[PDB]
Amino acid sequence: KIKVYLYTRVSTSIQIEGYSLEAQKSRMKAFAIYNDYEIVGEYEDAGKSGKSIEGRIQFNRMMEDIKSGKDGVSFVLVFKLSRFARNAADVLSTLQIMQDYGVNLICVEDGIDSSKDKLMISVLSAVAEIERENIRIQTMEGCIQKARE
Template sequence: MRSAIYARVSTLNGQSPEMQLAELREYASRRGWEIFGEYVDSGISGSKESRPELNRLMSDAHRRHFDVVLCWKVDRFGRSLKHLVNALADLDSYGVAFVSLRDNLDLSTPSGRLMFQIIGAMAEFERSLIQERVRA
């Protein structure tokens, strides 16, 4: 199985995606999955729908360059529930699975899809709290 790894950090001050990447590489290795590519957005908010590396990942998914997207946590993929639902529906229509390592989430299962809805709503709530603190 061919996998794509996606990582994101929203700020550049002291944060590095390397920890996310290391865990995702290890997971792919344990599953015996080939890593087609790594897509890393640094210094970009998860609330933005347009991110250079995420856009490239979605384009490659549409071309079926890989079978599964590995992400460290759902909130690294996005913090807007609408964006998450749309992006994951696109992946599903391309025949590409989605696995969130830390959330223990595999969207190829009914329970995984239910958990995704709950986790996505929590990520959007957390983003709202962050916005509120920034304005205060």
């Protein structure tokens, strides 16, 4: 059977968002079942620490386990991209490293599967260029302003 890892997270905290994590996980496990996948790892940044926005620790543990080939996984399943990456440049670099190491991405709710693609990479790269240029424009406007003060 095709081997997969499950990855789940909250954006803010478990207080605010925890309640829908288990509905996400159940959904992802059902999908695993219907597609005859074998789950060999589950990783979760559940927002259980006392800060406002959740970090990325288990996500980083997952990526080391991917790099190492430990479990021989073909996919990471996420609920959707916004429960995986913080912006387009993030989605892109993470996806590129994953595929470097033989691993594709399935977003269960979005219906996106990167192995059925390289159009996904082109769009993401194109949208990451939008974000970078927005940052340059903000920096340029900020230099104009610091120039009056």
